[PDB]
Amino acid sequence: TETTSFSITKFGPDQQNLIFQGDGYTTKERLTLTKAVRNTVGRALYSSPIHIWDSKTGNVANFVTSFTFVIDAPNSYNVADGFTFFIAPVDTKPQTGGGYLGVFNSKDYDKTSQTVAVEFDTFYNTAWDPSNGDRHIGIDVNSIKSINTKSWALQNGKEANVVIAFNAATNVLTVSLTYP
Amino acid sequence: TETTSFSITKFGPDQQNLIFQGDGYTTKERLTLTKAVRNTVGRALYSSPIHIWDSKTGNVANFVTSFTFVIDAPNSYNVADGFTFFIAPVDTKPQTGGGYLGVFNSKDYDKTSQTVAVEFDTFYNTAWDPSNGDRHIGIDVNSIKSINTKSWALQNGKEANVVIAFNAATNVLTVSLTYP
Amino acid sequence: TSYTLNEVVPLKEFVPEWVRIGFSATTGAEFAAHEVLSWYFHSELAG
Amino acid sequence: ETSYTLNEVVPLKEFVPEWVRIGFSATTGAEFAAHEVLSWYFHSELA
Ligand SMILES: CO[C@H]1O[C@H](CO)[C@@H](O)[C@H](O)[C@H]1O
Ligand SMILES: CO[C@H]1O[C@H](CO)[C@@H](O)[C@H](O)[C@H]1O
Numbered sequence: 316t317e318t319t320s321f322s323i324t325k326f327g328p329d330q331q332n333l334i335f336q337g338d339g340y341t342t343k344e345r346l347t348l349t350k351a352v353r354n355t356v357g358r359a360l361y362s363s364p365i366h367i368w369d370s371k372t373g374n375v376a377n378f379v380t381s382f383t384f385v386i387d388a389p390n391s392y393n394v395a396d397g398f399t400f401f402i403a404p405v406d407t408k409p410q411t412g413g414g415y416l417g418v419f420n421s422k423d424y425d426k427t428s429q430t431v432a433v434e435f436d437t438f439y440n441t442a443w444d445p446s447n448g449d450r451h452i453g454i455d456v457n458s459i460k461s462i463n464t465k466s467w468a469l470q471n472g473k474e475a476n477v478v479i480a481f482n483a484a485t486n487v488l489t490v491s492l493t494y495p
Numbered sequence: 496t497e498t499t500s501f502s503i504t505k506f507g508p509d510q511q512n513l514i515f516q517g518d519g520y521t522t523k524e525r526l527t528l529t530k531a532v533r534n535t536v537g538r539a540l541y542s543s544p545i546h547i548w549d550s551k552t553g554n555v556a557n558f559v560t561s562f563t564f565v566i567d568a569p570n571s572y573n574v575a576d577g578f579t580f581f582i583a584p585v586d587t588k589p590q591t592g593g594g595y596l597g598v599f600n601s602k603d604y605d606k607t608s609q610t611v612a613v614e615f616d617t618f619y620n621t622a623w624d625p626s627n628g629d630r631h632i633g634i635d636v637n638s639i640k641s642i643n644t645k646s647w648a649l650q651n652g653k654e655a656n657v658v659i660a661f662n663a664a665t666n667v668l669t670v671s672l673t674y675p
Numbered sequence: 676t677s678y679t680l681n682e683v684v685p686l687k688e689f690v691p692e693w694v695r696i697g698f699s700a701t702t703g704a705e706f707a708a709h710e711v712l713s714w715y716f717h718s719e720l721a722g
Numbered sequence: 723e724t725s726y727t728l729n730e731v732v733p734l735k736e737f738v739p740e741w742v743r744i745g746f747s748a749t750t751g752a753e754f755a756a757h758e759v760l761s762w763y764f765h766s767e768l769a
């Protein structure tokens with residue numbers, strides 16, 4: 316059996332167990348992924364690779380992760396692009412910025428991306444998003460085109476708590492986000 | 496608060512959350528650091544940096560670790576050299592082999608080392624080991640001459656389970672080796 | 676206020692045996708700061 | 723039911739860097755033995 320588990324309640328300046336990419340770094344004891352400045356991209360990864368399945372046995376793994384985050388726009392009308400929790404190959408590197416959230420490259424399903432991602436998306440990019448033009452949560456596997464969505468009303472500047480879990484027996488991935 | 500926790504109960508051949516150094520490699524669900532062979536050094540470190548104390552509050556961490564291990568030697572007389580669990584800087588690299596057990600360079604103290612190790616030593620090296628010639632468990636901080644040792648009878652070929660715990664409130668470090 | 680979503684997504688079809696988990700964020704012509712305040716994670720894989 | 727214990731006070735804060743890596747090493751010289759590890763469990767916490 317193998318487990319890996321970790322918690323970081325407070326983010327120090329030198330958070331050496333995180334790999335940072337783009338302008339992501341830690342500050343005011345938060346992990347700042349972007350600041351309110353156009354066109355940027357920030358990702359941060361946990362330094363250990365995680366064994367999520369195994370080819371000699373066929374067993375797959377369950378996982379749970381929870382985190383609290385804030386989105387900080389100036390008005391609830393001028394906000395983009397969103398934020399992501401994602402599982403990807405050991406060696407992932409930033410991908411297209413903007414509406415693709417630095418995690419995917421085409422809306423076209425790409426078997427070589429092999430990254431699934433949970434997005435908390437704030438800007439409507441007409442080519443691949445729910446037609447009602449709402450902000451939303453969604454599950455993405457290999458495309459920025461979510462396989463499934465649920466409308467979400469961003470509370471700008473409010474911390475939100477989210478848990479995401481996955482159970483290998485039923486292959487179900489569950490996403491909870493709740494503004495307190 | 497910040498925590499790092501993990502377990503590996505059966506070592507895979509593609510154990511990617513370990514960093515292998517020397518001739519340490521994973522095989523047959525076992526982690527092998529040395530085969531029964533002359534002049535080897537094998538090491539393996541967990542891939543994530545762990546935060547053991549913090550200068551910004553003076554807090555140091557509590558940790559506990561357990562492992563079971565086998566030393567398997569052609570007979571009980573000719574056995575060398577030893578095994579270690581060690582804490583060391585993020586970039587540590589094998590130091591001298593033989594009697595220095597892959598972690599230290601000298602019997603003289605050097606604060607440049609920044610390595611503390613609990614060693615289970617099977618070869619008596621007249622220059623620094625207990626003058627009785629016993630195999631011994633010991634704690635080593637920045638030197639291979641242990642700050643304290645304890646004699647131990649090696650049961651050759653048998654698993655042994657070890658628990659090493661550190662209590663930050665008292666800074667004590669405790670080691671037990673148990674054969675069944 | 677809560678929002679929940681569930682789905683079946685057989686991860687063994689999509690991701691490699693070993694992976695790295697992480698967060699991502701981006702702006703484009705419009706912007707917002709994106710910051711995480713805590714993060715807990717646990718996984719287990721039987722043998 | 724054959725045990726060995728050794729306690730010692732070691733202020734790790736004075737000898738070790740803030741961030742460290744942990745692990746095992748083993749070595750042989752002119753005499754030898756196989757040195758194998760069958761499992762490893764670790765937990766650490768910092769307030
Ligand atoms: C004869 O000395 C050699 O053999 C012993 C036993 O392996 C090692 O401790 C030592 O480093 C090596 O120099
Ligand atoms: C308008 O286009 C630009 O800005 C939007 C919103 O920030 C991004 O989603 C998009 O990818 C980027 O190209």
Ligand SMILES: [Ca+2]
Pocket residue numbers: 396397414436437438439440444
């Ligand atoms: Ca979008």
Ligand SMILES: [Ca+2]
Pocket residue numbers: 576577594616617618619620624
């Ligand atoms: Ca020795």
Ligand SMILES: [Mn+2]
Pocket residue numbers: 434436443444453459461
């Ligand atoms: Mn979307």
Ligand SMILES: [Mn+2]
Pocket residue numbers: 614616623624625631633639641
């Ligand atoms: Mn010794």
